[PDB]
């Protein structure tokens, strides 16, 4: 027969199954290029599996390999398209955990598309039977690839100019309770909070269009509350209108309405998806709007150290898509946050370049190729009694948000807003004069001193004095110093 005579007898392309590390997916003597995409994975092999074979399997199944030999490989420049595992190291103070570095060719990805990049890196590797657990810890995205993405629509610098606000963190609050209020009652809270001294207020992530309140009603009343407050104070004000919806057409309809009534900003949720997010960031740039991103759902895969994706990677992907704000943690609030890991997140979102810093979880040096900066947002069970800690851990480019910490004031919403602004102003002034505001004694005294000229602040300090959330963290570092 012709078929039998034309059988491939080459050692590499003869039919059958061979190890991934003998298929060309492991290369300890590999030289990395400045155009290559790189990934760091924390792998846990099944009892009996060789650490190097596991790394080679992850590289092959995330690039061009399958479980058995295929001759069709000879119709392509195979060597150029194969990903290559090049280093494997045991995780310190651990047995059965190893770090693995992998390099990918630039031509494997579609320009400007996050769905495509993720389809390769996280497509099916996490479900492989030969591994018991797996976690993507970091990535190095090259200058060449960064240039095919838009980056933030507004950016921190242009945004401060749009608000005429410079040299201090911005302030905000969420409307409470989460659900149940009508459009007219929603506008009343916005008017009150802004008038007391907040820069912005926001709808809860779960507020969209429901039987108790339809969206068009909420948008109209909110613009009346914003204009009233701005005319009474002489400042630019705003509220995050939520445009999250079930279909792309409905999203666009809500974005075009908010622009028509003159909103300076709008907000979206992470549950919408990568492609809907990319479309929204392109629209905001073409229509002069600020875009806020709520990270609903992130903790389903970013909480445990043994399996999933580390938040610092999500930070990079979202800065590439082009969002203007993103929730990043508080350290002292009611949600999870280790101080060393959080400092790493803030740096990834605000710096022009990153240098290796193991104790902070920074594994790769990387430049941002002049992409604009993304503004971090701190929210979740925090109060004016903790002002000294917030200034020391979060920095100056950040939005501090107080929901229960404002509406829960006994003397009204306007009183709550005033207590928060005064506390901040006094702390920054003291800092700029060279005081040790972080000391457990100096910090609180500074607030106490300011309180003796502002009744609202005195009331708040006495109310939430002994309030704290101390619990062991889940996601921690693997290095020290």
């Amino acid at each position: 027969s012709v078929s039998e005579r034309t059988r491939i007898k080459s050692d590499r392309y003869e039919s059958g199954v061979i190890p991934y590390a003998k298929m060309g997916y492991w290369d300890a003597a590999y030289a990395v290029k400045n155009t290559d995409v790189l990934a760091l994975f924390r792998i846990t092999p099944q009892p009996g599996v060789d650490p190097v074979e596991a790394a080679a399997a992850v590289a092959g199944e995330s690039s061009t390999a399958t479980w058995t030999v295929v001759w069709t490989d000879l119709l392509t420049a195979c060597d150029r398209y194969r990903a290559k595992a090049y280093r494997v190291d045991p995780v310190p103070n651990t047995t059965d955990q190893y770090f693995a570095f992998i390099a990918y060719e630039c031509d494997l990805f579609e320009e400007g598309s996050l769905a495509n990049l993720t389809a390769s890196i996280i497509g099916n590797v996490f479900g492989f039977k030969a591994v018991s657990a797996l976690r993507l810890e970091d990535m190095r995205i090259p200058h060449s690839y960064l240039k095919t993405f838009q980056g933030p629509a507004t950016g921190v610098i242009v945004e401060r100019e749009r608000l005429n606000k410079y040299g201090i963190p911005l302030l905000g609050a969420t409307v409470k309770p989460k659900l149940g209020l009508s459009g007219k009652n929603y506008g009343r809270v916005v008017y009150e909070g802004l008038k007391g001294g907040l820069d912005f207020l926001k709808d809860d992530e779960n507020i969209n269009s429901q039987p108790f309140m339809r969206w068009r009603e909420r948008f109209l009343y909110c613009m009346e509350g914003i204009n009233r407050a701005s005319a009474a104070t002489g400042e630019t004000k705003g509220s995050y209108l939520n445009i999250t919806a079930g279909t792309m057409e409905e999203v666009y309809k809500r974005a075009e309405y908010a622009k028509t009534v003159g909103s300076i900003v709008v907000m979206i949720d992470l549950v919408m998806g990568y492609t809907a997010i990319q479309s929204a960031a392109i629209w905001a740039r073409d229509n002069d709007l600020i875009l806020h991103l709520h990270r609903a759902g992130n903790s389903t895969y970013a909480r445990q150290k043994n399996h999933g994706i580390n938040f610092r990677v999500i930070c990079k992907w979202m800065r590439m898509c082009g969002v203007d704000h993103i929730h990043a943690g508080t350290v002292v609030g009611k949600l999870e946050g280790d101080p060393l890991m959080i400092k790493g997140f803030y740096d990834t979102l605000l710096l022009t370049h990153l240098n290796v810093n193991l104790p902070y979880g920074i594994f790769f040096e990387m430049t941002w190729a002049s992409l604009r900066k993304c503004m971090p947002v701190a929210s979740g069970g925090i109060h004016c009694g903790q002002m000294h800690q917030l200034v020391h851990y979060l920095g100056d480019d950040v939005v501090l948000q107080f929901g229960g910490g404002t509406i829960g004031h006994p003397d009204g919403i306007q009183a709550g807003a005033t207590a928060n602004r005064v506390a901040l102003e006094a702390m920054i002034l003291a800092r700029n004069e060279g005081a040790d505001y972080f000391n457990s004694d100096i910090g609180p005294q500074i607030l106490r001193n300011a309180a003796k000229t502002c009744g609202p602040l005195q009331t708040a300090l006495d109310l939430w004095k002994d309030i704290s959330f101390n619990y062991t963290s889940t996601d921690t570092s693997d290095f020290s110093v």
Partner: peptide, 9 residues
């Protein structure tokens, strides 16, 4: 260690 900065030019 410090070989991670030299192994990734």
């Amino acid at each position: 260690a410090a070989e991670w900065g030299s192994m990734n030019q």
